[PDB]
Symmetry: C3
Subunit: 281 residues, 3 copies
């Protein structure tokens, strides 16, 4: 008589209810969702972008009951993710798997905490892997877990029998990014860029006066890594455009069609480099 309770038991402490006493910008509301703690030490919670939208107040009911004060570390509408910290003790966490293992047909359960007093679970499979995960489990900002009961995704209800989650890998990338900066910008060919602060600039033996976008992380098999591009590079110049702003790469790129051969001047180990690169529909 197989059952999913055995693993569910294990992975439900690390689920939190989330209430957002917010006003609606120039009428009150109370948006409420669920969330998940990925670091128990630094007490990091993840949740939906849209839940903490317009948040004046941010409160996290633990599973053991501890109603709490949360802090918006950061957001990512680009993937509806959102990072929070709660200052607290005796916090339990359960395992994170690796999305890269996800086959379709793999069994999952979507878990949440819609009412703070409690739990909630649905069942289906990985339906499709489009960067969405698709699933026939019913739907948010909660855990998605595999048949081993490992945290492999985070749930995001949007616009039926079609659940939708975000891989925990992609979700770790934005989080850890958002933690380390007012972060997560995303740009060309699966790369993550940040602002080259003076403090960074010089930290890397460069000058404070020096400028570019800072390639923070290049995701493998990205046309960027293909283009020869790595983390710690400083895009000085996409084509004719002097890149001295981090969000230029994007606005710059967006205004160029697919099948177009682009020249990124990166600045690595104190020397310029053109990089043969290519845009893709």
């Amino acid at each position: 008589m197989p059952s999913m309770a055995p693993v569910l038991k294990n992975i439900m402490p690390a689920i939190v209810n989330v209430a957002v006493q917010g006003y609606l910008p120039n009428r009150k509301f109370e948006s409420i969702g669920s969330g998940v703690i990925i670091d128990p030490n630094n007490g990091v919670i993840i949740t939906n972008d849209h839940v903490i939208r317009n948040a004046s107040l941010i409160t996290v009911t633990l599973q053991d009951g501890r109603r709490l004060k949360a802090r918006l570390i950061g957001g990512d509408s680009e993937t509806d993710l959102a990072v929070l910290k709660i200052d607290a003790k005796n916090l339990k966490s359960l395992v994170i798997g690796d999305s890269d293992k996800l086959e379709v047909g793999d069994f999952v359960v979507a878990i949440g905490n819609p009412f703070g007093l409690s739990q909630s679970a649905t069942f289906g499979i990985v339906s499709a892997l489009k960067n969405f995960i698709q699933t026939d489990a019913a739907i948010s900002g909660g855990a998605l877990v595999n048949a081993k009961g490992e945290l492999i995704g985070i749930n995001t209800a949007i616009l039926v029998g079609i659940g939708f989650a975000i891989p925990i890998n992609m979700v770790k990338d934005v989080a850890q990014q958002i933690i380390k900066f007012g972060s997560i910008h995303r740009g060309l060919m699966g790369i993550f860029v940040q602002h080259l602060t003076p403090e960074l600039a010089q930290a890397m033996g460069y000058p404070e006066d020096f400028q570019g976008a800072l390639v923070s992380q290049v995701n493998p098999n990205s046309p960027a890594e293909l283009a020869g591009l790595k983390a710690g590079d400083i895009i000085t110049q996409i084509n004719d455009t002097k890149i001295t702003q981090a969000t230029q790469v994007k606005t710059t790129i967006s205004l160029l069609r697919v099948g177009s051969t682009v020249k990124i001047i990166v600045e690595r180990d104190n020397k310029p480099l053109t990089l043969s690169a290519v845009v893709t529909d």
Copy 2:
């Protein structure tokens, strides 16, 4: 290649289709549902309250085909349950489990008989245990069964991916209650009360002239059992109110807020007793 057919085979005889040739009170209708036989000897069927609502006629198609005459033993809108008896032979029944075992994540199948000629089955898990069972199996008055294929719930469609059932324990409580009386009233802190008939009154060595509500059954861990209250007690007096009516306890109680310290004079073994008790939101 695991499958649920093996147990389903076993537990489908005990499923019945139910047609209700009723009129609609001062236009005909024919409400139709499914039902389940819990006692094969006394030929007891359970079903939904709303199906037999306005029933002039009550007919039960067996699984083997025997269209039959049923009798409304009793109802319970309070939990949409409803108890019927069919006078008949060679009746088969399958196992009843224990709801108290139900973990969330546990696999279930919801079964029915919407067309009398036949069968119907859905799949999901125990989602939440609020006194509702929640489930992602699609939806009534039919069996819900565990992965061992045991009868653990009864289905009740109300007002999406959210099935809803009633635990077989709770369902046995009301049934066996309804059988033994024109029964099931429910009242304070998970207790069941009935009318102290003369016949009961004296049966318990009391007088016929004697009055109170008869505590018929106190459910464990109820604030009542906590309050010191047991089955066979006769609530003579909640607070200032002389309880000589069985439904007083309720109307009496309902008109008192939560966190309020209440005095039930019970009459046990021929002596009065105050009981320190407490209401709860």
Copy 3:
């Protein structure tokens, strides 16, 4: 940690996307579905009737990517099935099971290819076997497969939690029929009839001038097989009606109520035969 990926891997080559550049009869459209290859040698694809409805163009994206030209071999609105051929090489196919094995409760996965670039999978069980298969897997013209990952059905979305498929047996019957003729007519008591062409007529040692409907295949336990009727018979005469047209059997039959004792003069091995037969509601 059981999972369905292992079998899904195996059975996804044989899934095709299907685009129908059609006009709408006296405005363009592009109806698009999924389909499945049942014969890899003759390159036979099956799909929905309604997808290729009004098809001016018929194109089949393979799973490996090969966009292709298809040909409408034939249709069957009577069961929404439709048969196509694509002229092509290196084509892979996965196993076909036998619907007759299908118990309710049996696990299935519904698979498709709604976007040609890709895959898509849902999960449920065989709910009911009415000649429809009912299922709680979400929904077309795609594979339905058992827990052994065998092709046991084909999907057909019509007019909620109620998927609907057509058994692969029934689906092989119409296909192989449609292949061998401008075929599939269906008629009395689970029999399949075709036009007695001269070429057939004489092929069976008969005359070219000779006429009747050709009983092409009598399905077992059909009242026809019960009526004494077999494949290769030539219904010369249902009752008073001279059957010399193949679709007469139908129009003939349809205009006769249930519980009526019918006389089919068949012509077998060059001799007439009345057959005692019976219609059924």
